Design a protein around this ligand. Structure first.
Ligand SMILES: [K+]
Ligand SMILES: [K+]
Ligand SMILES: [K+]
Ligand SMILES: [Mg+2]
Ligand SMILES: [Mg+2]
Ligand SMILES: [Mg+2]
Ligand SMILES: [Mg+2]
Ligand SMILES: [Mg+2]
Ligand SMILES: [Mg+2]
Ligand SMILES: [Mg+2]
Ligand SMILES: [Mg+2]
Lengths: 110, 134, 289, 252, 87, 85, 97
């Protein structure tokens, strides 16, 4: 019987070595023959873009959605996307984490 | 019931095939010289690098039309506009300012991607868009 | 533009059936006789025929002889349902179709080809008898065509023959016109192809005259008319015999024939892609007459 | 192991570029990113028309409605032929029948007169543009998922429910297959025992169902079929006779 | 749930029973048989020889055509006579 | 509600069951025969198409029979098709 | 008076039953099926009301024309009287002429 893996969290934290890892993956996929202006390398080839994005998703846990796949045409766009962080905290947790004055109380009946 | 003798043949069905009409609008045949004697000119390939783009109709014609309301209000409508319709409006106003002596009155419908202008300037707008290559 | 709209839509709640509204300005409010503004008399005035809903018919002037009766009768629309009509086919539009490729000039051009290319709209039920080739845009028309119409003007014929081609005026009865305009519906009726009826006695002189390029005129008189038109309009008649398209230009159907390459009495299947030809002597005699 | 790469068969306009979507598989929980598919911008990236979506949804709701409500008028209510009392001298109100709407048990002045039909038809181009806009909205809001096939390892609906929960497909999922006869038996059995997971053929795709279901799932043949059907409208001629009748280049 | 099979147009020729009184006459006339043959080819089970008119119908059509359609020579002669009278 | 067979077909339906079903076929065909009577009190046009003098156009013309009432006394005599008008 | 003193029983609507789940399916049958069938052919109801719309007078005329022979005597008489009344109202009464 196949067992469903636990639901992955949507939270994302951009790694400090993100640029180096992205450059390494670009060298692996597109080849290390021409690494000049790697951030300007086009992603026109469907196979190459699929390989790069799949490797990045497997490495970092974050995958580019369909609504943003069409925007990805150069490595710089992917770098900016992975630099953009993502949070997954609930609304009540966000309100509690935000600095609340001592006279403000919030209760969550849901 | 006696019936007349009939001969079945398949060679003559080519005429029926010729008579059969099609559904897809045929592409315009290539012409050595442009514009054509009827006055039609194909869109420029590649499309011009402008913030906005104007798409040809299904008949391969400029989507500039005229409209009349109340029997006295005459308007010109540019349709199938993709991109910066505000930039298109600015360009149209700049183009039509010398002709009218004042800033033209225009409405921009961004949901439908249409530009409406007070007055009849259909031929002038068609020539302008053809020159631009849309 | 579209990309910006899609980007805005991405960061918005999912589109469902609980957040749909009509386009503003497309739904006028409905007025009902309720309230102070629209109640009481309810927009009907005071006592009278107008408020009680029983007022004279349209055109009644209150007893005075009406304007639509006091004018003497004259013959304007008398016999309108029996007047034959012809849709105009301008040379500008014909050149437009040829340039766009909707009507190829390398084959004979007639009502079937025009309808297939959506150049004309023929309504046999509205007393239409075909297309008249008007002379609009004759100066700029430059196309070698073999055009078949029902009426043709002298200027249009001159333009066609100057550019090089054959223009012929043919007649169709209403039934033949319907069949030639929409052959596909006819072949689904399971009926043999009928014969093209002769023109009426009032139209025989038009189609038996060489000056009108009639399809029942003497072939030997065509060159005289063509040369006369060329002399009148100041162009040289081009000898089409030396042209490679001579057979296509001279391809003319029989006056008793509806479709090119098809004879009356044949039945098309359009399912087995086969044509059945009768061999009975009486049927052959009737159809070849 | 090889990626599933899908390209657009129909000619994309020169001034636009095809959009891109992931191609996943239903054979495993983590079998995402099996390939990449290119989608025609005029179908999956057209302008968002919420007004057109509303028009198409209202048309679907109202065009096949038949209202059977009916009431009896004073001419149909039983009795009431005679005058209840003389016109003058009684000292009471003057009446002509006992089945008048003013009377208890009488007729209805302006009641429903069913059966009533609310039939009307939007233009074919508008009805196709509604589907185009719905697909584009789903793609833009990331409610659309493309699959190589709908085959499941088992017919247990709980597996599909757990897979949807794992992949965050929301409460309602609408699976679309190319043909009804060739639907996999595993997915058929999985969907037959579920309520919020509905399997329909490509012919049955509609704006109402797409809006009702939070997530839409399409196959590659379904995407090709939809692209062809929706882009045929943008280039078809005006009809001379119904398209069910033979044409030179139709169907296909 | 799974949707019901899509509604498909009824395949094959239809031959309503002539014995039933509720069967419409246009579904029993020979024109119906001709239309079915034209639409469905030879699978309709209709003899193609019946499409062409019977000898009686042919004679009736010939008589009507002779009565209400003058020949070209007759029309030309009548036109000539009328022109001579007017002149 | 509605009937399945229309009212005018009820007599034909009754002629298909019961005692009427067992009647000989030739008599049933004779009853079903509805040949138009020879015109007596009206003059038929004699032609299917006629030219209308008002517009000079060919029009289809029909010969509508004149209703004829046959008194019961006529059933014991030979009136040759004549009857009260 | 005239208003209930107790709350009515709660009303539960099964938003995901078969009918509501499959509502609207096959609406684009002609568009997505080579126009073999028209969407109006899926409408079920009275024979005289199938892909047709009109006012009350037109509906009555259509019903009398199509199923008038099959109607009951009283129903047919009421339909005839209704048609007469509607004719008089729509051709002899009103505000706009
Ligand atoms: K008032
Ligand atoms: K007032
Ligand atoms: K009125
Ligand atoms: Mg307008
Ligand atoms: Mg009051
Ligand atoms: Mg007064
Ligand atoms: Mg008053
Ligand atoms: Mg009464
Ligand atoms: Mg009385
Ligand atoms: Mg009264
Ligand atoms: Mg009551």
């Amino acid at each position: 019987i196949l067992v469903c893996p636990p639901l992955r969290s949507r939270a994302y934290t951009p790694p400090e070595d993100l640029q180096s890892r992205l450059e390494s993956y670009v060298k692996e996929v597109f080849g290390s023959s021409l690494p000049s202006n790697w951030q300007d390398i086009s992603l026109e080839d469907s196979r190459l873009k699929f390989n790069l994005l799949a490797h990045l998703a497997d490495d970092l846990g974050h995958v580019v959605p369909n609504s943003r796949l069409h925007q990805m045409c150069r490595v710089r766009d992917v770098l900016d996307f992975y630099n953009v962080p993502i949070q997954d905290r609930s609304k009540f947790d966000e309100l509690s984490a935000s600095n609340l004055p001592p006279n403000l109380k919030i209760t969550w009946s849901y | 019931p006696d019936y007349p003798r009939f001969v079945e043949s398949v060679d003559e069905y080519q005429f029926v095939e010729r008579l059969l009409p099609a559904t897809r609008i045929p592409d315009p045949p290539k012409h050595e010289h442009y514009p054509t004697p009827s006055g039609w000119q194909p869109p420029r390939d590649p499309p011009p690098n402008l913030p906005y783009f104007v798409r040809r109709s299904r008949m391969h014609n400029i989507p500039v039309y005229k409209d009349i309301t109340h029997g006295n209000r005459q308007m010109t409508v540019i349709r199938k506009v993709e991109g910066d319709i505000w930039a298109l409006q600015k360009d149209v106003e700049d183009f039509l300012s010398p002709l009218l002596g004042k800033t033209p009155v225009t409405q921009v419908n961004e949901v439908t991607g249409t530009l409406r202008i007070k007055g009849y300037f259909d031929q002038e707008l068609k020539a302008w868009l053809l020159e631009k290559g849309f | 533009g579209g990309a910006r709209a899609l980007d805005l839509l991405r960061g918005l709640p999912r589109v469902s059936l609980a957040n749909l509204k009509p386009n503003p300005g497309s739904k006028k409010p409905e007025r009902r006789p309720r309230g102070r503004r629209r109640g009481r008399k309810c927009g009907r005035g005071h006592k009278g025929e107008r408020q009680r809903g029983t007022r004279p018919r349209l055109g009644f002037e209150g007893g005075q002889t009406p304007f639509y009766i006091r004018i003497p009768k004259y013959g304007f629309n008398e016999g309108h349902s029996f007047r034959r009509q012809y849709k105009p086919l301008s040379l500008n539009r014909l050149q437009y179709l040829i340039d766009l490729g909707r009507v190829d000039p390398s084959q004979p051009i007639d009502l079937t080809q025009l309808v297939n290319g959506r150049g004309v709209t023929i309504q046999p039920l509205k007393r239409d008898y075909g297309v008249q080739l008007v002379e609009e845009g004759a100066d700029t028309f430059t196309a070698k065509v073999n055009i078949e119409v029902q009426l043709a003007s002298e200027l249009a014929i001159a333009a066609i023959e100057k550019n090089g081609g054959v223009v012929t005026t043919a007649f169709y009865d209403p039934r033949s016109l319907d069949i030639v305009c929409k052959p596909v519906p006819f072949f689904l009726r399971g009926q043999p192809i009928p014969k093209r009826m002769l023109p009426p006695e009032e139209l025989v002189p038009y189609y038996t005259d060489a000056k009108n390029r009639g399809y029942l005129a003497d072939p030997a008189k065509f060159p005289e008319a063509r040369l006369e038109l060329a002399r009148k309009y100041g162009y040289i008649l081009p000898d089409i015999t030396k042209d490679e398209l001579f057979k296509m230009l001279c391809t003319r159907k029989d006056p008793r024939q509806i479709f090119f390459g098809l004879a009356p009495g044949w039945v098309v299947n359009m399912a087995d892609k086969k044509i059945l030809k009768p061999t009975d002597e009486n049927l052959l005699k009737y159809y070849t007459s | 192991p090889e990626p599933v790469l899908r390209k657009v068969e129909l000619p994309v306009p020169t001034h636009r570029r095809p959009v891109q979507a992931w191609v996943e598989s239903l054979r495993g929980f983590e079998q995402e990113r099996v390939g990449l598919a290119d989608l025609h911008p005029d179908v999956f990236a057209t302008a968002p028309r919420l007004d057109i979506l509303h028009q198409v949804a209202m048309w679907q709701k109202n065009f096949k409605r038949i209202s059977y409500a009916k009431t009896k008028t004073r001419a149909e209510v039983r009795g009431g032929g005679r005058k209840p009392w003389p016109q003058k001298g009684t000292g009471r109100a003057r009446h002509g029948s006992i089945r008048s709407p003013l009377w208890r048990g009488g007729g209805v002045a302006h009641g429903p007169r069913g059966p009533t039909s609310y039939y009307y038809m939007l233009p074919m181009k508008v009805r196709a543009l509604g589907l185009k806009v719905a697909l584009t909205v789903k793609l833009a809001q990331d409610d659309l998922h493309i699959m190589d096939s709908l085959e499941l390892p088992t017919g247990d609906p709980q597996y599909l429910t757990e897979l949807a929960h794992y992949r965050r497909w929301g409460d309602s999922v609408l699976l679309v297959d190319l043909t009804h006869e060739e639907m996999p038996q595993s997915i058929v059995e999985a969907t037959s025992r579920l309520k919020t997971f509905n399997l329909i053929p490509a012919v049955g795709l509609n704006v109402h169902s797409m809006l009702k279901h939070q997530t839409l799932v399409l196959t590659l043949p379904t995407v090709a079929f939809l692209e062809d059907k929706l882009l045929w409208q943008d280039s078809r001629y005006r009809p001379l006779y119904p398209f069910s009748l033979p044409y030179s280049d139709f169907p296909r | 749930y799974r949707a019901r099979p899509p509604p498909r147009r009824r395949p094959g020729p239809r031959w309503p029973d002539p014995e039933d009184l509720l069967t419409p006459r246009w579904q029993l006339g020979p024109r119906y048989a001709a239309k079915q043959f034209a639409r469905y080819g030879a699978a309709s089970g209709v003899v193609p020889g019946s499409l062409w008119p019977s000898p009686e119908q042919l004679r009736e059509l010939e008589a009507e055509e002779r009565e209400w359609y003058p020949s070209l020579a007759t029309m030309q002669e009548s036109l000539r006579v009328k022109q001579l009278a007017e002149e | 509600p509605l009937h399945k067979y229309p009212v005018w077909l009820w007599k034909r339906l009754q002629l298909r069951e019961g005692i009427c079903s067992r009647l000989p076929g030739h008599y049933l065909r004779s009853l079903e025969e509805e040949r138009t009577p020879t015109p007596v009190h009206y003059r038929p046009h004699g032609a299917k198409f006629k030219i209308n003098p008002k517009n000079g156009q060919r029009e289809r013309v029909e010969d509508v029979p004149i209703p004829i009432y046959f008194p019961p006394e006529s059933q014991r005599g030979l009136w040759g098709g004549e009857g009260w008008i | 008076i005239g208003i209930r003193l107790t709350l009515p029983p709660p009303k539960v609507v099964d938003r995901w039953n078969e009918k509501r789940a499959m509502f609207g399916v096959y609406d684009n049958i002609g568009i997505l099926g080579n126009f073999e069938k028209h969407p109006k052919e899926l409408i079920r109801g009275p024979i005289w009301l199938r892909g047709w719309k009109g006012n009350e007078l037109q509906r009555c005329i259509r019903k009398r024309k199509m199923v008038g022979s099959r109607m009951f005597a009283d129903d047919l008489h009421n339909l005839n009287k209704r048609i007469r009344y509607l004719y008089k109202h729509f051709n002899r009464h009103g505000k706009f002429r």
